[PDB]
């Protein structure tokens, strides 16, 4: 795939839309979009499984986290393609494990 989208759904007001684009089969993947309804501060952000860490997103005082990352680890093609895998964000601010997630399956757009 060349483009993909995850619709993130969580508890209460947590919801978001994250886009993935990759021009070429082995090339870098642009990840961009936003998540709203979050508590202020850092929230863990990654593709479920191995090889999918996207670090943290930062939610502002309105609970909005804008996302604009380029990542050369993940791919939309090949064996560890993230297509069909689950994108998650921890609803609990800060580091460590969390049980309350907002999530969505990464679906093909193009």
UniProtKB/Swiss-Prot annotation:
Changing residue 60 to A: In ALS1; does not seem to be linked with a decrease in activity. Zn(2+) binds at residue 53. Pfam families: Sod_Cu. One of its GO terms (molecular function) is small GTPase binding. Cu cation binds at residues 46, 48, 90. The keyword Oxidoreductase applies. The modification N6-acetyllysine is found at residue 92. There is a cross-link at residue 32 (1-(tryptophan-3-yl)-tryptophan (Trp-Trp) (interchain with W-33)). Binds 1 copper ion per subunit. Homodimer; non-disulfide-linked. Homodimerization may take place via the ditryptophan cross-link at Trp-32. Heterodimer with SOD1. The heterodimer CCS:SOD1 interacts with SLC31A1; this heterotrimer is Cu(1+)-mediated and its maintenance is regulated through SOD1 activation. Interacts with DAOA; the interaction is direct. Destroys radicals which are normally produced within the cells and which are toxic to biological systems. This is Superoxide dismutase [Cu-Zn].
């Amino acid at each position: 795939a060349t483009k993909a989208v995850a619709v993130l759904k969580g508890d209460g007001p947590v919801q978001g839309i994250i886009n993935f684009e990759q021009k070429e089969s082995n090339g870098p993947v642009k990840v961009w979009g936003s998540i709203k309804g979050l508590t202020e501060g850092l929230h863990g952000f990654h593709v479920h499984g191995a090889g999918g860490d996207l670090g943290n997103v930062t939610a502002d005082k309105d609970g909005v986290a804008d996302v604009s990352i380029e990542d050369s680890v993940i791919s939309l093609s090949g064996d560890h393609s993230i297509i069909g895998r689950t994108l998650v964000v921890h609803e609990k601010a800060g580091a460590g494990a969390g049980s309350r997630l907002a999530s969505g399956v990464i679906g093909i757009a193009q």
